[PDB]
Ligand binder design. Structure first.
Ligand SMILES: Nc1nc2c(ncn2[C@H]2C[C@H](O)[C@@H](COP(=O)(O)OP(=O)(O)OP(=O)(O)O)O2)c(=O)[nH]1
Ligand SMILES: [Ca+2]
Ligand SMILES: [Ca+2]
Ligand SMILES: [Ca+2]
Ligand SMILES: [Ca+2]
Ligand SMILES: [Cl-]
Ligand SMILES: [Zn+2]
Length: 575
């Protein structure tokens, strides 16, 4: 559909027209045309095919607008929009759209103050320049600064784990709206993508317009950006940018599929539908005018002749073909994970004692937890020394002797020196239950040198896991450059697992490299890199990553029970 694209075009024409000081009647008309297109559920092209008169039946559309609709459908553009674009630059249009600014103010700001950009706008805000205009007080001042921040965030992405719990708190409030029967967090978040744009929620309701009203008036909501009969876009007090879509309860499953995407996955499904005489839309699966499916997502997949496809797979990267042949991959599931294989403690940089870690693991129903404190070079500190590291092993063993399950594995996260040697001697490594190795320095070695360093680390027969291999920090540090094929192949041959560290701003291995490692036949270790017990919740992110990477419970260390895990760790591994 081109409905939303055209709604935007007319809205922009309205804004630019008002900026230029066109007829307020014409300005309001463009905005009403925009609302109509925003709310219109049927494709605008289907009405356009019926003719100019049919377009004019729509609320707000007259002879002028109907010709512009046809122009857009025939050429892909509207010359009027292009004409106003010649008179109104992009930066000045960006300024006017900030909440609390608007077209007329933007004109004064353009002509009198020299503000043609968000940059200048922020400069003015920060210096108090705007306070020297009539109509400007601390209330409007606060709105404009915040509007600017929201504008600048809308381009950008945040780690999934930075926003998922906040999204779930909003989901609770949405579910609690009277009139809402079901709701779900959809979009890329439901697919467990490691960074997300806006958050998208689907609601089932028989009273959609009233559900939208309740939603936009939730205590959590700060600003409404767009609102109509069945959808809204808002900004929360906590910053989150959120889209809502409402469908009738009979359509909920089709709405879930629609709003979960990816868009590429949905293109595949719509073609499969039409190839068997059906139409898939947000509202259901239809044979002619008759709705034959829609209430549940599994019913929708079934109507297309498919098994239900897990959301993390829905990227058009082989899942449609696998579903068509009745051979979807077996995927790791969160209940199958029996422990977390990288947690830190007060022996190094963690906030928790052994007792606190044990208690948290016991609450979670884990069989074990690996306490993997840093070697001295990681912390850029003096210790723990090799002697202290061994003393700690004895303490963890005594803790297990006095506590029982969940058992603590006495581990370490051992720094890899620039030359590929390890930051504990073999007499420490051999006594550890679990040896992780990782890069914490010299992140920018030439690719060939970084590769050699990692290969040399993997020579050591006491190593079990390559921890957070790329060392990336989302928003702070790029992945290290290394030949991952060479690194993974050596790890496979040596019996060393690669880690998926689900700590929210690590997400390392990323899904794509995890998919590569698992496809090459490696073992996988999941962890949260916890430094406080609240971090243990990130295991869901590591599992979601595994699912995106087509990883099953086979060759995942965390699906082994304690005895089987210790056996794996002690075994002659590799070729
Ligand atoms: N049929 C159809 N579905 C769409 C279209 N655009 C988006 N969708 C569906 C599939 C998307 O996964 C879902 C949410 O759209 P978003 O633009 O928010 O993307 P998504 O959440 O997947 O990724 P993001 O992290 O926000 O970049 O809506 C479209 O043009 N046609
Ligand atoms: Ca009309
Ligand atoms: Ca409710
Ligand atoms: Ca989204
Ligand atoms: Ca969206
Ligand atoms: Cl469902
Ligand atoms: Zn580390």
């Amino acid at each position: 559909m081109r409905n939303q694209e055209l709604a935007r075009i007319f809205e922009e024409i309205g804004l630019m027209s008002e900026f230029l000081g066109d007829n307020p009647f014409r300005v309001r008309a463009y905005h009403q045309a925009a609302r109509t297109l925003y709310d219109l559920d049927t494709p605008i092209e289907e009405i356009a095919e019926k003719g100019k008169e049919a377009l004019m039946e729509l609320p707000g559309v007259g002879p002028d607008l109907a010709e512009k609709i046809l122009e857009f459908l025939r050429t892909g553009k509207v010359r009027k929009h292009e004409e106003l674009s010649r008179k109104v630059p992009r930066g000045v249009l960006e300024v006017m759209e900030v909440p609390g600014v608007g077209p007329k103010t933007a004109r004064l700001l353009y002509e009198g103050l020299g503000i043609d950009s968000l940059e200048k706008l922020k400069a003015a805000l920060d210096r108090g320049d705007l306070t020297r205009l009539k109509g400007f007080g601390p209330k409007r001042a606060e709105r404009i600064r915040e509007g600017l921040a929201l504008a600048q965030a809308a381009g950008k992405r945040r780690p999934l784990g930075a926003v998922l719990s906040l999204a779930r708190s909003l989901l609770e409030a949405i579910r609690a709206l009277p009139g809402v029967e079901r709701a779900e967090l959809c979009g890329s978040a439901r697919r467990y993508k490691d960074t997300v744009g806006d958050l998208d929620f689907l609601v089932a309701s028989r009273e959609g317009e009233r559900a939208v009203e309740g939603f936009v008036r939730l205590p959590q909501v700060k600003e409404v950006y767009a609102k109509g009969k069945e959808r809204a876009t808002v900004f929360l007090k906590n910053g989150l940018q959120v889209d809502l879509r409402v469908v009738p309860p009979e359509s909920y499953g089709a709405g879930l599929q629609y709003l979960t995407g990816s868009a590429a996955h949905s293109i595949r499904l719509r073609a499969l539908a039409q190839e068997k005489g059906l139409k898939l839309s947000e509202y259901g699966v239809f044979r002619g005018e008759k709705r034959i499916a829609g209430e549940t997502e599994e019913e929708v997949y079934a109507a297309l002749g498919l098994p239900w496809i897990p959301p993390p797979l829905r990227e058009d990267q082989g899942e449609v073909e696998a579903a068509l042949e009745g051979r979807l991959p077996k995927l790791l599931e969160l209940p199958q994970v029996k422990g977390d294989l990288q947690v830190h403690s007060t022996y190094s940089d963690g906030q928790n004692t052994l007792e606190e870690l044990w208690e948290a693991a016991k609450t979670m129903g884990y069989r074990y937890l690996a306490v993997t404190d840093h070697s001295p070079a990681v912390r850029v500190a003096g210790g723990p020394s090799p002697e202290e590291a061994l003393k700690r092993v004895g303490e963890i063993r005594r803790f297990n002797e006095t506590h029982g399950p969940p058992y603590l594995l006495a581990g370490a996260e051992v720094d890899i020196h620039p030359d590929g040697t390890l930051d504990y001697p073999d007499w420490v490594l051999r006594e550890l239950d679990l040896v992780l190795v990782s890069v914490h320095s010299r992140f920018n070695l030439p690719k060939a040198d970084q590769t050699k360093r990692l290969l040399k680390a993997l020579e050591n027969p006491f190593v079990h896991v390559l921890a957070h291999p790329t060392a990336r920090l989302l928003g702070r540090r790029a992945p290290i450059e290394a030949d991952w094929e060479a690194v993974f192949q050596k790890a496979k041959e040596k019996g060393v697992a690669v880690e998926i560290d689900g700590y929210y701003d690590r997400m390392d291995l990323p899904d794509d490299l995890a998919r590569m490692a698992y496809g090459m036949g490696l073992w996988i270790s999941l962890s949260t890199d916890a430094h406080q017990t609240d971090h243990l919740r990130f295991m869901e992110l590591a599992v979601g990553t595994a699912q995106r990477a087509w990883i099953g419970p086979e060759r995942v260390l965390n699906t082994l029970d304690y005895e089987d895990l210790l056996s794996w760790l002690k075994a002659r591994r590799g070729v």
